[PDB]
Amino acid sequence: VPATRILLLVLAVIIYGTAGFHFIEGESWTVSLYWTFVTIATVGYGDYSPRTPLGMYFTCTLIVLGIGTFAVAVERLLEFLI
Amino acid sequence: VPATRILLLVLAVIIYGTAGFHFIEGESWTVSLYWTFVTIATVGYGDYSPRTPLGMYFTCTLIVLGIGTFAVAVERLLEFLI
Amino acid sequence: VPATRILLLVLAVIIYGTAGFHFIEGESWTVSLYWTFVTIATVGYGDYSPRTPLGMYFTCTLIVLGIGTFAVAVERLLEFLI
């Protein structure tokens, strides 16, 4: 699968996660972007996390849609850097 | 291994984790489902975590049974979405 | 690599992590075992974490020695269960 397509897919995940956290959980755009990376990378510091049932359901969807996409993106980036 | 079988396996893990956390640690069904996804995806925010020895042992079993199952499920989903 | 050998390797990691956390950080044997699984699986709730410089260095060694070993163990277990 072309590297650039994987890039677009991970960008779409990032937009989805950031806007979702911002609107559902009410955190700033910057915090929401940071939380999205931390979540889809599976780092999960827990400095930010959803507090609402909708936010919890949303987070599960982001986990399912985002962790695999991010994993493929990082491995494709590895190839270009290495 | 057929994608639908992997789906059933991950659903079984989700049921096991959710019911276990709910009954052992006493959190709501929704929180317990959320905690199960967060745990088997290895995100591990730590907003919820077991506080009892039984809950700790149970969590180790969920980790062993669930992380691999979830990993295979997400990669199979990737194929269908990509 | 034989599945049983991978089993022994992950058990050795578990012993190393549990005894190390118990003696360096002073937590109970049960908490230390739980923390070891949570760490080598990369779940990392953060309900327990090292507070001392020695504990921090030790945790880095466990991360390096344990995450790969655990990953191989879970995938080998997948095969037997599936």
Add this chain to the structure above:
Amino acid sequence: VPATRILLLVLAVIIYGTAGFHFIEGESWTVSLYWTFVTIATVGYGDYSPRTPLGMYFTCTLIVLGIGTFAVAVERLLEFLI
């Protein structure tokens, strides 16, 4: 890719993450090294995490540059130990 080259790459990531956290977030060199391992391994305890917008952006860059590099390093180490 030669194992020793992967070693140098992961060391470079470790230096980048440690110095960055130390200077941006103001934590000690030891805490910063520990946080770097915890982050690139995706353990993410959350005992330490960035509190500033710059630190958040920096952490996202470390996540992208470091998680894949660390993953390849651990698997290469597995081979030598096994």
